[PDB]
Amino acid sequence: GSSHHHHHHSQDPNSSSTKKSAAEASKKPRQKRTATKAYNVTQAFGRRGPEQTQGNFGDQELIRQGTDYKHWPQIAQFAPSASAFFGMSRIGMEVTPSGTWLTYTGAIKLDDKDPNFKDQVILLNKHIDAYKTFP
Amino acid sequence: KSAAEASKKPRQKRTATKAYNVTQAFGRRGPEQTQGNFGDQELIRQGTDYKHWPQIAQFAPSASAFFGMSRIGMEVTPSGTWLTYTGAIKLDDKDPNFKDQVILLNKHIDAYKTFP
């Protein structure tokens, strides 16, 4: 069935799917959640939109599929490891009326010697602010 | 892994350790706009070998959350093409460990200002 198919493999259809239910996946802290077809980007991380507290990344297909998206590894290659997240980013702490927040900012350079560089630019352009085009 | 092997990973995928420390993997800490500012001398020297690394890493985002929560941009400059990101991760102020989490994060934020 649909829940047996992951990005790199399909399970035995007689087995239980190893995808987490939305009920279980939602018990993780927001930053540790993993979106899949069973627990989509909106469920895990909220709507895409223009406000500073909303994410802006992902077209309709990526939003619905999360890490099941056909090109997920080509996006995830730019996400930082935990060591790199705290190593590369400017980290701050803000206390606001909405709570206490760990802020992060940074920039990650694409490798222009990577043979896929041009396709990486096209793929990122397809998802950055993609919600502006949604019907 | 040796520094020579660990350094072959893309910067965003590197894992700092005692053999390939935070400065080697991610550059010197400092105040500039895209320069990292996090880590005291102990964390800089030890990276993920730092004994309290799990209490820091609990706040690092999965790849899915990084792209789900953050505001992402792309800039083309004379140095290359850069994926920019900003965001914020909410601490659970109801967690009984909240006060200690704040202490641990503050101990590393801008710690470099106190040492060469």
Number of helices of chain A: 6
Query: Helices and strands of chain A, in N-to-C order?
Result: HHHHHEEH
Strand order across the largest sheet of chain A: 1-2
Give the chain pair forming the largest contact, with residue counts.
A-B, 60 and 60 residues
Global outline of chain A: globular
Strand content of chain A: 5-15%
Radius of gyration of chain A: 17 Å
| Oligomer class | homodimer
Range of helix content of chain A:
25-40%
Q: How many β-strand runs of chain A? A: 2
Q: Kindly give the count of domains of chain A.
A: 1
Q: Give the biggest beta sheet of chain A.
A: 2 strands, antiparallel
Q: Kindly name the structural category of chain A.
A: alpha+beta
Straight-line distance between termini of chain A: 30 Å
PDB class: viral protein
Keywords: SARS-CoV-2 COVID-19 Nucleocapsid Phosphoprotein, viral protein
Assembly: dimeric
Entry title: 1.45 Angstrom Resolution Crystal Structure of C-terminal Dimerization Domain of Nucleocapsid Phosphoprotein from SARS-CoV-2
